[PDB]
Amino acid sequence: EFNILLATDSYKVTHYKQYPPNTSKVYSYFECREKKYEETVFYGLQYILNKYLKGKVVTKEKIQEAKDVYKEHFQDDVFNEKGWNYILEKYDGHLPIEIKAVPEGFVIPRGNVLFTVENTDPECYWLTNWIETILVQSWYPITVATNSREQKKILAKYLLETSGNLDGLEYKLHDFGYRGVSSQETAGIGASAHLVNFKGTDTVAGLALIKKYYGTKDPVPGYSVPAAEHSTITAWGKDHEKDAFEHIVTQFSSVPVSVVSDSYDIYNACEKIWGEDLRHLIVSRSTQAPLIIRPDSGNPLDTVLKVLEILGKKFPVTENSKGYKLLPPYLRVIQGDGVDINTLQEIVEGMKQKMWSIENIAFGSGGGLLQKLTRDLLNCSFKCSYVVTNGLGINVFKDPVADPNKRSKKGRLSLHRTPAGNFVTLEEGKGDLEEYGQDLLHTVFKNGKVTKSYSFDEIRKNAQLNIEL
Amino acid sequence: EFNILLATDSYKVTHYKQYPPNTSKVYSYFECREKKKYEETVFYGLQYILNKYLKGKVVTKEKIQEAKDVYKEHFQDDVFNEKGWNYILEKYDGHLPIEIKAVPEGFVIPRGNVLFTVENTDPECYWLTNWIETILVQSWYPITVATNSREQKKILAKYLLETSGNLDGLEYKLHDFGYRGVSSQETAGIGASAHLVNFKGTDTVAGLALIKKYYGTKDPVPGYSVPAAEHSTITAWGKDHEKDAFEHIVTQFSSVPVSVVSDSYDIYNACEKIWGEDLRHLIVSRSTQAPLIIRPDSGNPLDTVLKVLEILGKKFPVTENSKGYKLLPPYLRVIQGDGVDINTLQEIVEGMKQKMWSIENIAFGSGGGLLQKLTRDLLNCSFKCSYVVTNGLGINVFKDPVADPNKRSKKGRLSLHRTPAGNFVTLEEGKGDLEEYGQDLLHTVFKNGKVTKSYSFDEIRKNAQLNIELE
Numbered sequence: 025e026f027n028i029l030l031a032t033d034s035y036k037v038t039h040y041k042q043y044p045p046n047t048s049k050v051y052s053y054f055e056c057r058e059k060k061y062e063e064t065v066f067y068g069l070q071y072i073l074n075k076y077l078k079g080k081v082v083t084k085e086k087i088q089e090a091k092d093v094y095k096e097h098f099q100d101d102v103f104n105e106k107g108w109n110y111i112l113e114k115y116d117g118h119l120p121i122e123i124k125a126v127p128e129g130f131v132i133p134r135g136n137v138l139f140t141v142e143n144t145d146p147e148c149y150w151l152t153n154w155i156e157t158i159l160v161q162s163w164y165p166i167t168v169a170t171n172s173r174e175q176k177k178i179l180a181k182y183l184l185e186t187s188g189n190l191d192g193l194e195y196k197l198h199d200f201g202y203r204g205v206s207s208q209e210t211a212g213i214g215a216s217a218h219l220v221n222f223k224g225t226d227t228v229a230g231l232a233l234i235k236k237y238y239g240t241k242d243p244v245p246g247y248s249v250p251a252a253e254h255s256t257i258t259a260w261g262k263d264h265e266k267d268a269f270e271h272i273v274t275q276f277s278s279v280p281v282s283v284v285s286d287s288y289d290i291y292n293a294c295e296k297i298w299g300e301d302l303r304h305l306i307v308s309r310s311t312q313a314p315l316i317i318r319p320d321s322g323n324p325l326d327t328v329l330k331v332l333e334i335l336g337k338k339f340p341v342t343e344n345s346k347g348y349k350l351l352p353p354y355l356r357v358i359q360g361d362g363v364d365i366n367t368l369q370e371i372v373e374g375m376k377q378k379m380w381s382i383e384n385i386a387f388g389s390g391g392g393l394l395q396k397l398t399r400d401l402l403n404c405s406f407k408c409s410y411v412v413t414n415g416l417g418i419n420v421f422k423d424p425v426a427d428p429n430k431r432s433k434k435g436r437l438s439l440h441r442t443p444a445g446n447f448v449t450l451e452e453g454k455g456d457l458e459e460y461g462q463d464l465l466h467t468v469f470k471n472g473k474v475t476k477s478y479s480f481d482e483i484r485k486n487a488q489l490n491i492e493l
Numbered sequence: 494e495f496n497i498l499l500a501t502d503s504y505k506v507t508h509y510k511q512y513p514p515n516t517s518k519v520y521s522y523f524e525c526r527e528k529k530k531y532e533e534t535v536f537y538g539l540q541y542i543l544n545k546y547l548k549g550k551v552v553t554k555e556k557i558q559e560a561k562d563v564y565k566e567h568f569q570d571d572v573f574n575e576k577g578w579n580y581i582l583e584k585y586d587g588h589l590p591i592e593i594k595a596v597p598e599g600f601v602i603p604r605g606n607v608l609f610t611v612e613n614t615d616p617e618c619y620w621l622t623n624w625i626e627t628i629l630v631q632s633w634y635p636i637t638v639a640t641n642s643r644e645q646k647k648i649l650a651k652y653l654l655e656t657s658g659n660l661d662g663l664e665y666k667l668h669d670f671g672y673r674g675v676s677s678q679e680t681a682g683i684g685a686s687a688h689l690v691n692f693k694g695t696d697t698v699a700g701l702a703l704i705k706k707y708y709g710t711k712d713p714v715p716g717y718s719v720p721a722a723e724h725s726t727i728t729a730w731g732k733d734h735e736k737d738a739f740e741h742i743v744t745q746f747s748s749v750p751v752s753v754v755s756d757s758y759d760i761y762n763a764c765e766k767i768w769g770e771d772l773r774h775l776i777v778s779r780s781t782q783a784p785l786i787i788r789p790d791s792g793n794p795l796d797t798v799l800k801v802l803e804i805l806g807k808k809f810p811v812t813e814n815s816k817g818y819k820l821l822p823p824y825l826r827v828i829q830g831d832g833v834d835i836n837t838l839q840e841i842v843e844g845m846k847q848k849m850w851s852i853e854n855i856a857f858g859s860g861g862g863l864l865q866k867l868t869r870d871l872l873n874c875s876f877k878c879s880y881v882v883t884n885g886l887g888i889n890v891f892k893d894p895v896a897d898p899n900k901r902s903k904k905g906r907l908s909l910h911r912t913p914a915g916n917f918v919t920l921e922e923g924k925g926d927l928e929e930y931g932q933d934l935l936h937t938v939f940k941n942g943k944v945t946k947s948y949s950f951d952e953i954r955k956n957a958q959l960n961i962e963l964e
């Protein structure tokens with residue numbers, strides 16, 4: 025079972041001994057440091073607060089366990105047993121910490137304070153940065169949500185341009201990343217972050233995360249439809265690809281169905297199998313139940329364009345009010361190979377150049393959506409800015425000579441609206457001067473309790489694109 | 494509680510309706526597909542997955558109903574195979590009728606070889622083999638962490654041996670700083686455990702408990718750390734009192750090794766004036782078993798390491814070792830823990846060698862580069878069906894996409910063997926049955942809900958040793 029005394033970087037076990045004597049306060053903050061990705065979606069802290077930080081997180085057993093582990097890990101006794109016991113005895117093991125944060129779903133420019141952390145008991149000065157490691161993991165849902173939203177912006181631009189509206193936008197980028205992430209827990213967190221922006225997911229783990237920690241009015245936040253994989257095609261034998269196709273589309277005759285078509289020869293499959301042999305089974309389908317053809321190999325742009333050209337000669341294509349080509353409503357394409365933010369952009373621009381509407385296509389993204397991301401992308405960072413020692417408050421910061429980009433903010437921080445309606449972070453307690461109105465951070469955690477929270481429905485609202493608004 | 498019925502890709506819920514009728518067996522395999530460097534991979538991590546997620550009673554009435562309810566809304570349709578899951582519950586008390594055979598954990602195997610196979614043991618459960626693709630394929634992560642970590646050990650070993658004449662301290666030269674930089678607590682434990690296959694230094698505490706619970710070691714713990722500052726414990730003293738912070742910290746930890754980040758304001762000043770003059774007397778008095786380890790944390794990693802060494806070499810008594818390389822006094826060492834991945838690690842040690850500094854002088858910390866900056870595409874980790882039985886006839890199956898030969902999959906029943914020259918070969922089409930190639934290196938590790946063969950972390954470390962270490 026999870027032990028918060030074992031959920032920090034090893035060296036922080038030794039930090040209580042290193043602060044100035046008589047330090048009563050350590051105040052720290054998190055930002056996506058400024059140096060693409062000019063704004064970030066703040067999402068995922070609520071999960072962390074609830075799963076890991078709230079309530080009785082310290083017990084006698086947990087203290088003894090950490091002591092026993094650290095004795096061996098350090099080959100020495102450096103663990104702060106006394107400090108953790110104080111929390112257990114004084115607060116029934118509830119963390120005497122206060123955290124303030126911007127609302128989940130908020131879209132905030134880089135280099136602003138997103139959350140702050142401080143101890144509420146002078147004895148627990150060391151506690152603020154003990155929990156740095158767990159809190160900093162919020163980088164992941166923030167970065168997934170942010171990158172997913174940037175992709176939605178691209179899709180919106182091109183869908184709007186080639187079709188004249190945004191119908192179907194929230195189903196244009198589907199999460200295929202379950203197998204390509206590093207763990208079950210990561211799958212749930214990452215999938216939920218993608219769902220801030222879209223409604224299509226195969227990463228089932230995200231649904232229960234959202235239900236437990238955020239909630240939606242709707243029964244579920246994300247959806248899928250039947251689809252083949254290579255095994256359900258290839259199992260029929262190399263000479264029976266047509267039979268597999270026919271069986272699958274007949275099994276799923278009245279719901280949407282996606283069929284991967286590149287097991288042997290994508291171009292043959294589109295031109296001869298779907299386009300001729302089984303055409304009669306496709307042109308009969310409901311607009312509510314298209315066949316969605318899936319290529320899965322080759323150059324992503326070149327393959328998409330060739331697949332569309334093939335289908336456009338076998339099926340009745342129309343020209344929409346914008347002058348772009350549209351497959352008939354019972355036939356669509358999904359490209360779910362090699363898709364990341366860069367290749368997504370190359371594909372939609374390439375389709376636009378060849379006069380194909382973005383209405384024709386959806387994208388699936390796995391590793392690119394959920395795994396190919398690091399803390400460096402948005403420079404997510406947690407730093408101490410204020411301490412009280414001998415009763416005196418001091419504004420503190422790092423400012424490395426060789427890299428101004430790593431300079432941290434000083435003193436007590438607050439978030440405000442500027443006269444033009446943008447965000448500004450005020451340093452050095454200047455928020456107290458009340459020249460910039462009220463602090464936009466809310467207390468979300470205090471003394472073991474979650475004090476403010478957001479539904480997944482409100483997070484989605486906060487995260488909307490300007491174009492959608 | 495974890496629900497295996499909710500731990501697959503959505504579309505796999507619909508696959509039981511798509512296989513050929515009269516199919517009794519689906520047999521699938523996992524490989525790190527050969528591309529067109531990472532020419533060999535460390536197989537590690539399956540044992541964790543088997544124990545945490547696959548073994549024992551994993552199906553219950555409540556879990557089946559839960560899945561039914563979720564999928565009804567997720568698909569806006571009733572597609573879920575309730576009958577198939579009920580069958581497993583009734584006939585096998587909720588244990589998976591699956592057999593998995595795998596190469597021993599720790600084994601180092603060239604790309605394009607079978608690492609494990611999966612098949613159903615009951616004809617009714619043909620659909621189950623690929624249901625669990627999603628959870629099994631996540632083994633890509635500990636494989637890739639272990640492999641990339643080992644490739645870094647090879648670079649360190651080559652340069653340590655060249656500049657010092659031996660491998661002393663190699664197992665402590667790449668420390669895991671990745672706890673905060675990975676995507677979740679679970680990922681942290683798994684990734685940290687995989688790094689420990691190759692090294693002994695970690696700050697990612699989560700790895701220790703995973704190893705104890707799922708693998709085990711003779712020693713109390715698999716990994717170690719030592720006291721160290723962070724920017725907060727320096728900056729809290731105030732900009733004008735960096736020296737006071739340094740003095741306080743090395744005095745607190747005067748008898749153990751201690752690392753002190755030195756770039757809060759001016760790394761070069763800190764080394765030349767603070768460590769090299771003001772506080773020199775507190776450094777030169779230290780034990781060889783308790784050095785000060787100076788940590789820069791910004792600037793160009795190579796340029797900064799070299800300049801730091803340049804500065805320290807002029808303030809402290811440096812010797813020339815028997816290989817002609819410069820060596821800091823035993824009480825003074827350096828760790829570079831910013832911007833390190835396999836590429837920059839290589840650039841740093843080669844740069845050090847060019848400037849005649851022994852690799853003895855330095856250690857590396859890696860966080861995101863070590864544990865997060867990896868994907869399934871690095872080693873092309875992939876799970877594919879190679880054999881099915883339909884109407885009682887076995888057929889060898891595969892994909893072979895016209896526009897990408899690299900994605901062609903293997904055919905039929907597979908086995909892994911030693912070649913006459915002592916290398917590895919995967920035999921396809923059941924050809925291992927001909928017995929021309931000695932015994933199958935795959936062992937049954939899971940069968941019908943039970944883990945049937947396990948490895949200790951000690952055995953895994955042994956299997957994953959570098960050739961240079963063996964020699």
Ligand SMILES: O=C(NCc1ccc(S(=O)(=O)c2cccc(C(F)(F)F)c2)cc1)c1cnc2n[nH]cc2c1
Nearest residue numbers: 198200224226247248249251280282358386502504
């Ligand atoms: O095809 C897969 N999953 C099913 C699937 C997902 C997404 C689509 S879609 O065309 O975007 C689509 C169409 C209509 C409704 C929805 C809706 F509204 F439901 F979202 C989604 C169609 C089918 C699939 C394929 N390959 C994969 N690799 N790894 C995971 C994978 C998942």
Ligand SMILES: O=C(NCc1ccc(S(=O)(=O)c2cccc(C(F)(F)F)c2)cc1)c1cnc2n[nH]cc2c1
Nearest residue numbers: 033035668670694696717718719721750752828856
């Ligand atoms: O300094 C940090 N951790 C403590 C630490 C780790 C590793 C070393 S080391 O020089 O490799 C070393 C020296 C002697 C023994 C060991 C031994 F045998 F114990 F492994 C390790 C010295 C100190 C640290 C620094 N920055 C970080 N960012 N994110 C996580 C971080 C952790």
